[PDB]
Amino acid sequence: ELKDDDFEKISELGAGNGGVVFKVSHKPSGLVMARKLIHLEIKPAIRNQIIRELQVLHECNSPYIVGFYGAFYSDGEISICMEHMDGGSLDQVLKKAGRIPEQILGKVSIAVIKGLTYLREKHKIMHRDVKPSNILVNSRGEIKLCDFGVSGQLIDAMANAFVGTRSYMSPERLQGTHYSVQSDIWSMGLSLVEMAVGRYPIPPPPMAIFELLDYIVNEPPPKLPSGVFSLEFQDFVNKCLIKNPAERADLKQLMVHAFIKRSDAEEVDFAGWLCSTIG
Amino acid sequence: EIEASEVMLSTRIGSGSFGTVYKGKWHGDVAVKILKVVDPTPEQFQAFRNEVAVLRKTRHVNILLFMGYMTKDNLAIVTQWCEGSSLYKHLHVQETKFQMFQLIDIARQTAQGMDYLHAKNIIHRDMKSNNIFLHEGLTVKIGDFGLATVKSRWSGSQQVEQPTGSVLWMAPEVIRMQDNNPFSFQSDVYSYGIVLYELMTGELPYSHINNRDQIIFMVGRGYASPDLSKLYKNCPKAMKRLVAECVKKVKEERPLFPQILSSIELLQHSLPKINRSASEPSL
Amino acid sequence: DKEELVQRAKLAEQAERYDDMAAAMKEVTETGVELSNEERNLLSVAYKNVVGARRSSWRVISSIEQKTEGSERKQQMAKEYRVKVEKELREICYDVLGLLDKHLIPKASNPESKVFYLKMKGDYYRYLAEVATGETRNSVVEDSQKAYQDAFEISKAKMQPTHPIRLGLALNFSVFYYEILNSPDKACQLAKQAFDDAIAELDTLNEDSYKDSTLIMQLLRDNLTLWTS
Amino acid sequence: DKEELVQRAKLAEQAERYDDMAAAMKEVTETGVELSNEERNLLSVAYKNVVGARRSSWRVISSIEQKTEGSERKQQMAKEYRVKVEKELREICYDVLGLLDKHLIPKASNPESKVFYLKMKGDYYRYLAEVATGETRNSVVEDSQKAYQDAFEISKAKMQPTHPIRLGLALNFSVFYYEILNSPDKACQLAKQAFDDAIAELDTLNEDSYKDSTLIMQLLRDNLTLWTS
Ligand SMILES: Nc1ncnc2c1ncn2[C@@H]1O[C@H](COP(=O)(O)OP(=O)(O)OP(O)(O)=S)[C@@H](O)[C@H]1O
Ligand SMILES: Nc1ncnc2c1ncn2[C@@H]1O[C@H](COP(=O)(O)OP(=O)(O)OP(O)(O)=S)[C@@H](O)[C@H]1O
Ligand SMILES: O=C(NOCCO)c1ccc2cncn2c1Nc1ccc(I)cc1F
Ligand SMILES: [Mg+2]
Ligand SMILES: [Mg+2]
C-alpha cells in the first residue's frame, strides 16, 4: 500500500480551494508522483468509504485519464497518489501563453471528449469538474483528465468547503438539476472558451462568485469573439454552450462535429508548442 | 508585536480558510496561525495591527485570548491554545452524544461570547462550528473572530471585499455581496442560527446538496433554507422558534443577540425534568 | 364547526397518531363541504401514512413468505396473516375512494383540485392493484389507468411544467407504468418528457414551491437511471 | 401449537404490527404454559411498544394543552381528547396487571423470572401514576414501591450486581424516585451505588452479556450526569 512516510516532497505543484498537490518521490519505488492532500473533518467510517470508492481508480486506464497508484488518509487529510504531469494544468499554460492556439484547442477538445466518453462508457462516471485546472498535459504531448467524481462520499465531504472565485458549473447544475453528461459538456465548452480568449469569459467583455453564477444562469451563454476564429470552432462551442440540456449536443454529435474532424485531420506539434510556451 | 524567537512552533494542527495552525509554547501553550497573505500592503498591515490591538483589548470567559502578532516567521497571529476538541468535531466528527440541556447550555455560552464580541463592535465573521471549542468538557470558547483585514485579500491599498470561508454558515446577504459592507451583526446572527441548527440536528444543513456552487447560488437566491424538519423531537418548541428566527432570509428579521440570550434563559427556565429521565431500553 | 375538527385532526397528526386523524378527516369529508388547499394536505398525508404502514407490513410479510421456503404450517399461517392485513388495506382504500368519488371529485371547482384528487384516486387504485393478484387485478388496473389519464390530460392542458402537482403526477404515472404494466420503455419515455418539460421552465420557480420541485426532479432522475440500467 | 403462536407473534413483530403481537402473546400466557426467556422477552417488548407509543402521544397532548391558557374554549376539547387517550391508556395497563396477577407471578420457578415480572409490574404502575393524580396517584405508587422493593431484595440475593436485569431494575427504580417522588438525592445515591457495584464486579460477564450491560451502564452514567447538574 501507500503511506505518508514513503514520500519525500520535492515541491508544491499547486493549491486550490480543496487542497494542495505536492510533487513528491515515492521512496520504495523511486518514482516521482503527485500527492494531493485534501483537508476535511469527517467520521472514520466516511473516510474508509471514500478510500474504498477511490480504490476503483485502479482500472481506470486511458490515454485521456491521468494515472493512479493509491490513496490513503494520514491525518485529517485525504492523500491521493497519481502520476506526475510535467506540463501541469491548462490554467498554468494560460498563465504562460496569453491565449491558446486554435489547433491546440481542437486537440484538447478531442482529448476531453475521448476522456468523458471513456468515463461514461466504462465507468458510468461523470467528471462534474471539467475545468482548465483539471486538464493535465505531458512533456510528450499527452492530455489527460483528473479530479473527476469517482467517490460520491468524497463529493459529499467536499460539499463543505470555502467560497470560490470563479465557477465552471452549468446553469442546470446550479438550478438543482442534472442532465448526465451534458453538464460536463457545458463545462468543456466554457473551458475551451476561457482558453481561447485570454480571460474568464463569464463577465463578457471583477464580479463575486454569486454574481458569476447568477449571470451564467440568467444570461445568454458566452461566445467566441467572431473574426479571429474559424467557423467550425465557433459552431462547436455554441453547440457546447447551450442553456437547454436537450438541445445541447451530446458526446456523439460533438465527436462527428466539423471542428473536431478538422482538428483531428490537422497535425499539430503540441509537445513542441508546449515546451516553447512553458520553457 | 511579539518576538518570534520567544515562540517555538510544535507539530502542525491543520489549515483553515486564511491560515495554518501550529502549536506553540510562548509563555505557555499557544496556537500560532501562519497567515496565507504573503506581502501585506503597508495600509493592510496598519489595519491588521489596529485590529490586533482591538482583539488584545478583549477579555471574556467564552472567547479565547488573543496574545498578539509577529512579523518575523512570515505573518502570524498568536492566540490562547485550547486543549478541548472543536464543537464541529464533537457534533460531527466525534458524534458526541449531548443531552438537550447540555446543548442549551452550549448555545447559551456561545450567545454570551458573541454578545461580548458585538458589544465591542467586533464582527466575528467566519463564525461557525469549527470556530467553537469545548474547553474543559462543556465550556464554550470562541475563536478566529474579527480579523477582517487578513481573511479577505487586498488589491494593493484596497481590500478585495469578496466573501470568504465556508458557505454553509455564510449569510445570504453576504453571499450576494449586494452591498460593499454586507458583514454586520445580523450575518453573525445567521451563522449562529446555522450553528444552532447543527446542534439541534447533529448534521450539516443542506445534506441533499453535494456541490458548493449550487449551495452558493440557491442560498443567495433564497431558494434554499435550513429545513426545520430535521430538528430533534425533544427540542423545546421555543428553541425551534428561536432557530427559525435566527436563519431568517430577511436581514432585518433576525433578532439581536441580547434577545437571543433572553430567549435562551427563558428556555432554561421552562426546561422541565420529566422527559430528561431515560428508562430501560428494549434490549 | 369545521375549525375544531381540523384543529383536532392536526393535533392527532402532531401526536403521530394516524387513526383518529384519518377518522376525523373522513368525518370532515362527510360534511360534504368543499376542502381548502391546506385541509386537503392533511387528508392526503393521513391516508398516505395509514396505507404506507400496511404496505410496508405486506412487503415484509411477503418477503418472509418467500424466504421461509419450507413445508410446514408457518407458511400457511403467514399467508393467513398476509390476507388479513391485505383485507385491512383493501377496506382502507375503499373507504378512501368512497370518501373521494362521493364528495370530492364530483364537487371540485378548481381544476388543480381535480388533478390532485384524480392523482389520489389513481394512487389508491394502484395500492389496491399491487396486492390483488388474479382476475380482479385487470379492473382496478384499468380504473387507475383512466384516473391517471384524466389527470394527465388536465395537467398537460392547464398546468405548469414546473408545478409540483404535475411533476408528482408524472412520477406516479411512470412508476405505475414500470411496476404495474411492466412497460419500461414507455415509462422511461414519460419520465424523460416530464423531465425535459420541467427543465425548460426552471427560471419560473417561486418561493412558494421550490423544495418539492427539485425533490421530485431528483426522484425522477433517480428513477431514470434506475430504469436505464 | 404453542410454537405456532410464537411464530405468529414473531411475524407480527417483523411486520411492525404490535397490537396483533400483544394479543397473540396475551393469548399465549393465558394458557399458563412454561415460559422461557425468549417467550417472556417478546411479551415485554410488545407490551412496552404499545404503551410507549400512547404515552409519548399523551406527553405531546399534555404539552400542547398548556401551550396557551389565554384563549377561547379550544383547551376544553383538548383536555377531553386527552381523557380519551388515558381511557385508551389505563385499561391496557390494567389488562397487563391482571395478566401478571393471573399466571406470571404464581407460575414462577426461578427467582430471576420473579424479579423480571415484579419489575414489569412496577414499570406499568409507574406509567399509570403519571396520568393518575390525587389519591389515585398515591394508591398506584404505593404498589410500585412495594413491587420494586420486593424485586430489589431478590435481585441482590440471587443475582450479581452486574446482571442486566438487576441494572435495569435499579435504573427504573431511580427514575421512579426522581419523577414521581421527587427525591433526586435518593435516586442519585441508589444509581451511584449500583454503578459502583457494577464497576467493582466487571469483566466477568458472558460473551452475550457485553452489549446490554454496557448499554445500561452507559445510560446510568447519562442519568448521573443529568442529575448532577
Ligand atoms: N498530476 C498532477 N501533475 C501536476 N500538477 C498537478 C497534478 N494534479 C494536480 N496538479 C496541480 O494542482 C493544482 C491545483 O488543482 P486542484 O488541486 O485539482 O484544485 P483546482 O484545480 O484548483 O480546482 P479548484 O476549484 O481551484 S480547488 C492545479 O493547478 C495543477 O497544476
Ligand atoms: N485556538 C485553537 N487552538 C487549537 N487548535 C485550533 C485553534 N483554532 C483552530 N485550531 C485548529 O486548527 C485547525 C484549522 O482551524 P482554522 O485554521 O481556524 O480553520 P477553521 O477554524 O476550520 O475555519 P477558519 O474560517 O479558517 S478559522 C483545526 O484542526 C482546528 O482544530
Ligand atoms: O480532487 C478532486 N478535485 O480537485 C479539484 C476539484 O474537483 C476530487 C473531487 C471530487 C472527487 C470525488 N472522488 C474523488 N474526487 C477528487 N479527487 C480525485 C479523483 C480522481 C483522480 I484520477 C484524482 C483526484 F484528485
Ligand atoms: Mg482542482
Ligand atoms: Mg478556527
Residue numbers in the entry:
A (entry chain B): 62 to 266, 307 to 380
B (entry chain A): 343 to 625
C (entry chain C), D (entry chain D): 2 to 230
From the study:
CRAF (RAF1) is one of three RAF-family kinases that initiate MAP kinase signaling in response to activated RAS and is essential for oncogenic signaling from mutant KRAS. Like BRAF, CRAF is regulated by 14-3-3 engagement and by intramolecular autoinhibitory interactions of its N-terminal regulatory region. Here we describe cryo-EM reconstructions of full-length CRAF in complex with MEK1 and a 14-3-3 dimer. These structures reveal a fully autoinhibited conformation analogous to that observed for BRAF and two “open monomer” states in which the inhibitory interactions of the CRD and 14-3-3 dimer are released or rearranged, but the kinase domain remains inactive.
The CRAFSSDD/MEK1/14-3-3 open monomer cryo-EM map has a nominal resolution of 3.9 Å (unmasked), and despite use of a 30° tilt in data acquisition, still suffers somewhat from missing orientations. Nevertheless, the map clearly reveals key structural features – the CRAF pSer621 phosphosite is bound on one side of the 14-3-3 dimer, and the MEK1 kinase domain contacts the opposite protomer of the 14-3-3. The phosphopeptide recognition groove on this side of the 14-3-3 is unoccupied, confirming that the CRAF pSer259 motif is not engaged in this state. Notably, there is a visible gap between the CRAF and MEK1 kinase domains and the 14-3-3 dimer with no apparent density for the CRD, indicating that it is released and does not interact with 14-3-3 in the open monomer state. The 14-3-3 contacts the C-lobe of MEK1 in a loop region (MEK1 residues 238-241) and makes a glancing contact at Pro346. As compared with the intact autoinhibited state, the 14-3-3 domain in the open monomer is re-oriented to expose the dimerization interface of the kinase domain. Although the 14-3-3 remains bound to the pSer621 site, it rotates by ~180° and shifts by ~35 Å such that it no longer sterically occludes the kinase dimerization interface. The open monomer structures also indicate that the pSer259 site is exposed for dephosphorylation in this state. Datasets used for the CRAFSSDD kinase domain open monomer and CRAFSSDD open monomer were recorded from the same grid, the latter at a 30° tilt to mitigate the effects of a preferred orientation of these particles. We propose that the open monomer state represents an intermediate between the closed, autoinhibited state and the active dimer configuration.
